[PDB]
Design a protein around this nucleic acid. Sequence first.
DNA 1: CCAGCAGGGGTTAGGGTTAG
Length: 294
Amino acid sequence: ATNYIYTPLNQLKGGTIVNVYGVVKFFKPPYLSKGTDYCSVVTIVDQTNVKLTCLLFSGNYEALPIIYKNGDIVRFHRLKIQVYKKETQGITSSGFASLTFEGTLGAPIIPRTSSKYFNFTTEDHKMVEALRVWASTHMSPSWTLLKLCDVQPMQYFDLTCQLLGKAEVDGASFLLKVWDGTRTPFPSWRVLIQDLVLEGDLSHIHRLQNLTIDILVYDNHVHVARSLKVGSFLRIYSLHTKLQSMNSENQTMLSLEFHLHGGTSYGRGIRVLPESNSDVDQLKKDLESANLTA
DNA sequence: CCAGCAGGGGTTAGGGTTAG
């Protein structure tokens, strides 16, 4: 019946509505725009090495591409191609639809989408496989996905973790206590907050003290941090580590601060990962052994 | 893909890390 045609990224013409396959080179997770919708920015690339930036809007958070990390594969239906400021740009069109897939070779091809129904053929399976192999041989794996024991000061990195605690601070910032089972090279900083505010299991937080980091998120992230459920699994993008040296009269002290600064550049943001995600499976293994020996 | 299917309101943001 229906046979969708997929346009290679080097054949895209302005003024058309197309369907595309791609590998994610960069993305902003959905954030509240200044308009009525969530917005997600996604730059994709295919075998032609030509890239395409896509500006996607929706009132439904999950209707935007379900992207968890660079190297994810995406398939877009009914994406409008236009020219903005003399550059090619993909934008939401009526009925826009997204499928996304893990990029790791050999993994099952399981579409991630909010669509109730979607078209998917054997050819689609093959194209996803081909993009996986091409990405394995043409894109460097991200050096930003680091466990807490591998972080260095004065760097940006993406953190897969579990949320243990939440707390208000000063309205412009918000505290998240998270862990991943590994211990930072330097002890985490402890943000100043009121003890009654700390939302979460207090004794569990206490016995995991040596493994937990404090993250201070700011500005647009606050709302998001406020909605998170304690115990859920998160990926926090472009978290910033800073080695503070607090020295009093006859004492020095080195701590690691973790800031999620305001704005959306470099993908700064938070996404909840489902338990069906494989990185969550590995994280769970680490969490179980660490909670055993803590 | 779907609210719609003899076709679909409007704006939003349009990657690129000040810091607190």
